[PDB]
């Protein structure tokens, strides 16, 4: 009983993100977590992965005109978590039905035929424990694959396969 | 007030579509068309394609719980157009901002590494010409690639390459 | 399906309802829920609200010739849910397009210049979760105001504004 | 501001309750449910029952010096459940043996030669099921009359014979 209790997360500024313009808030404790993949290339060093989070955000902000990067968090192959819209802000990653009730975490890369390395999976699962510890997620939150709530291949066959084994997975 | 029979279109009953539960209407004339791909398996024959349209609909209806397959029309490699939600019903293809202002056509298959055959491309273009003559689409309608309004690989690199050349395409 | 029954509902017999002659069943699970107001007298007490339920049913059966109170459920300002045709029977409350696909719940009163109390709103929302849990409603169900599916003032400006904030509301 | 759920409970603030000062927590899943009657005045309308929960709490807080009304939940003859200490706070209703291992619910009134109306009994069981849904109550939960765990006439002969006919009642 040490209050914070969880997660090292690379913050927005540390990855030089553009300021967010999003104001819509999620209502904690959140019950659903939606796992996607960027379906782009991977990265496996702090500097590349930080560079890739900037790209993704650029796509969503510069091209799509969104208020900030879609995801609440992004997972690098560097084994670090990148802060997106975070725990309190409604993300734009699952559709109008799941966005206001979920936390979207996206693995940077394409896992159709490839798996995230062990450290990326640990960072993702540690992030979720962190979420529960903070009361950001319900203790009995449910994890969905992106393809379970939207017509997409996301998070990729290999990763989809993995999250299906998870404690909190519920299709 | 003279209308043409531009419909080469395979009716829902003909591809044996489950009945639609969708009620929200599109107001005509519609200004935008959003092109996507199913990122699925392709089909080249009226028989294999009717089957594919069934599966794509099954996925959206049975797995995702939607009122009907999300696209307004699907395009087969058999060179035929499969009726989805049609010209009058709002689709569920490109998010809450674009769904209500556009018609969503999806080519059945994954075009990341393949272009659709000429006849598939002819069908799509003919469908659009059809739409204009029917008054369903504004004559100066704009084409967008899925990845232009939502974060996706869709419609696939090759197919995206192609649509960027189209007369009605717009940044 | 699932043993655990749901919610507190004032049964037909308790509010002394005339027996139903209504036979057309709804197809479970139902996708839509239409919210109306009776535009009639309000009541704040079990005694007065049972009475009002009786009068609404009476007027529908005796003056309109319907087989049963047209609503599937009624909501009182006493904060209780009154059993109408229930979950399995088709109501007569939204027109012929909608009556066969939806559940109709009506707040007893006229909401144009009044909002119904929190307990009424609570009863209504709780009833819907119960329907979902029972399998009578789709987990994804969509809530609509009576005025969205028919030309009407129902459910009344004030109540219509409130249901627009419901997490399952789709215009 | 905490408004989800559930068994349709009138929240603390809605009945104008003094803020609680209790800090002791209950270890969920809880095992026992004790049923008592207030032995006070009964009420049949939301207005009168809110006033009655207030009176009970005031007596407990001003006169006995307790941190909060001692019951976790109060049941009014209006068919509504009134929030007391709730699911997460240890109450003061059945003694030091029973207060830390049980949830105490109290029917407002004197049921010696009187019976609570069906709607009051409905709210009660509905309350109990919603407790399970949350993990606050263990599905195996046993129901005890106040008089089964303490020397007291509570909850009254009449109400006591009834709770014995309940499915989870253990003598
Ligand atoms: O979570 C939200 O949508 C609000 C954040 C604002 C940025 C997004 C703009 C909305 C434009 C439609 C884009 C689709 C993409 C998939 C998720 C549902 C929205
Ligand atoms: O929202 C309202 O005002 C109406 C009440 C909804 C009915 C209750 C649903 C039964 C299952 C409880 C689910 C709850 C547990 C509390 C936290 C969020 C979800
Ligand atoms: C799961 C979900 O709600 N997604 C789609 C959404 O993209 C669209 O805004 C809406 C319009 O019909 O249809 C929904 O089914």
């Amino acid at each position: 009983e040490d209050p914070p209790a969880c997660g090292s997360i690379v913050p927005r500024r540390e990855w030089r993100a553009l300021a967010s313009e999003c104001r819509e808030r999620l209502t904690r404790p959140v019950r659903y977590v939606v796992v996607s993949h960027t379906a782009g290339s991977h990265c496996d060093t702090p500097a590349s992965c930080a560079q890739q989070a900037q790209n993704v955000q650029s796509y969503h902000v510069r091209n799509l005109g969104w208020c900030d990067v879609g995801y609440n968090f992004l997972i690098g192959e560097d084994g670090l978590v990148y802060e997106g819209r975070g725990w309190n802000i409604k993300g734009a990653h699952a559709g109008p039905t799941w966005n206001p009730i979920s936390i979207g975490i996206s693995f940077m890369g394409n896992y159709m035929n490839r798996v995230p390395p062990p450290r990326a999976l640990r960072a993702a699962q540690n992030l979720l424990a962190c979420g529960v510890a903070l009361g950001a997620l319900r203790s009995n939150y449910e994890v969905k694959g992106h393809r379970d709530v939207q017509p997409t291949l996301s998070p990729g066959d290999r990763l989809y396969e993995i999250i299906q084994t998870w404690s909190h997975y519920r299709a």
Side-chain angles (χ1 to χ4, degrees), chain A:
Chain A
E1 304 290 28
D2 136 73
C6 74
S8 355
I9 284 166
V10 185
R12 299 185 69 77
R13 205 185 209 289
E14 186 160 310
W15 58 269
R16 289 265 312 304
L18 286 157
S20 146
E21 321 277 20
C22 315
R23 337 231 89 80
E24 290 168 316
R25 299 180 56 76
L26 284 176
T27 294
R28 47 172 65 206
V30 177
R31 188 171 316 248
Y32 305 102
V33 169
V34 188
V35 179
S36 65
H37 73 182
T38 39
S41 55
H42 45 107
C43 56
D44 65 336
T45 80
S48 23
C49 279
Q51 174 45 64
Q52 188 160 333
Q54 215 172 354
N55 295 344
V56 176
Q57 182 201 31
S58 185
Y59 171 23
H60 301 190
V61 186
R62 309 276 206 216
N63 300 157
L64 308 186
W66 290 0
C67 56
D68 184 28
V69 63
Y71 320 116
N72 288 278
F73 304 94
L74 296 94
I75 311 295
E77 302 220 1
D78 55 2
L80 309 180
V81 178
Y82 291 73
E83 184 193 3
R85 305 203 179 179
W87 297 120
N88 321 122
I89 306 297
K90 180 171 77 202
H93 54 89
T97 300
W98 298 85
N99 284 348
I101 46 171
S102 76
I103 277 296
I105 74 179
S106 185
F107 287 64
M108 302 176 119
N110 187 309
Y111 307 87
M112 270 308 299
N113 357 271
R114 140 199 195 64
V115 289
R119 66 191 177 265
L121 301 178
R122 278 195 305 282
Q125 307 217 253
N126 198 80
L127 173 70
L128 296 193
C130 197
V132 166
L134 287 166
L137 292 176
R138 315 201 156 255
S139 62
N140 70 325
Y141 68 84
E142 290 174 52
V143 176
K144 311 281 202 182
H146 192 185
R147 63 177 56 169
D148 291 323
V149 305
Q150 295 289 79
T152 172
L153 298 179
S154 168
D157 292 32
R158 298 315 192 75
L159 171 48
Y160 183 68
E161 183 167 351
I162 295 164
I163 67 178
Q164 282 193 308
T165 63
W166 295 3
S167 181
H168 289 69
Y169 184 84
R170 194 151 175 212

